[PDB]
């Protein structure tokens, strides 16, 4: 209560800070698209055979 | 085709282009309340229009 406005701004910034490296670049996503990455390898490979 | 299926034809007589495409197929299932219920269905006949 005593410290709620540095608080709420802090809050603030660091979702301001999130947005801003998910807008720039993004290989955090990686982990779905390596779950995207293998079933199109495995299809590849039926059509091939 | 990357599977080696022909899938462009040159007409012997005329020389016009002809693609060629498979003809409808598809999955079916049979949706059903039950035998004890009644003896009626429902049929879903996939991917089609
Ligand atoms: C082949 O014959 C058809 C009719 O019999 C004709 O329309 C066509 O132009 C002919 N093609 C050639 C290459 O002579
Ligand atoms: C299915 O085919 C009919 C007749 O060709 C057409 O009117 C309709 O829009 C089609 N529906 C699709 C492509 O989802």
Same mark, same amino acid.
């Given at each position: 209560?005593?410290?709620?406005?540095?608080? $709420?701004?802090?809050?603030?910034?660091?979702?301001?800070?999130?947005?801003?490296?998910?807008?720039?670049?993004?290989?955090?996503?990686?982990?779905?698209?390596?779950?995207?990455?293998?079933? $199109?390898?495995?299809?590849?490979?039926?059509?091939?055979? | 085709?990357?599977?080696?299926?022909?899938?462009?034809?040159?007409?012997?007589?005329?020389?016009?282009?002809?693609?060629?495409?498979?003809?409808?197929?598809?999955?079916?299932?049979?949706?059903?309340?039950?035998?004890?219920?009644?003896?009626?269905?429902?049929?879903?006949?996939?991917?089609?229009?």
């Amino acid at each position: 209560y005593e410290n709620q406005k540095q608080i $709420a701004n802090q809050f603030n910034k660091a979702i301001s800070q999130i947005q801003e490296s998910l807008t720039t670049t993004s290989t955090a996503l990686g982990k779905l698209q390596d779950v995207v990455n293998q079933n $199109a390898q495995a299809l590849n490979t039926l059509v091939k055979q | 085709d990357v599977s080696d299926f022909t899938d462009s034809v040159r007409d012997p007589k005329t020389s016009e282009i002809l693609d060629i495409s498979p003809c409808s197929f598809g999955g079916v299932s049979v949706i059903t309340p039950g035998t004890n219920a009644s003896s009626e269905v429902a049929v879903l006949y996939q991917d089609v229009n």
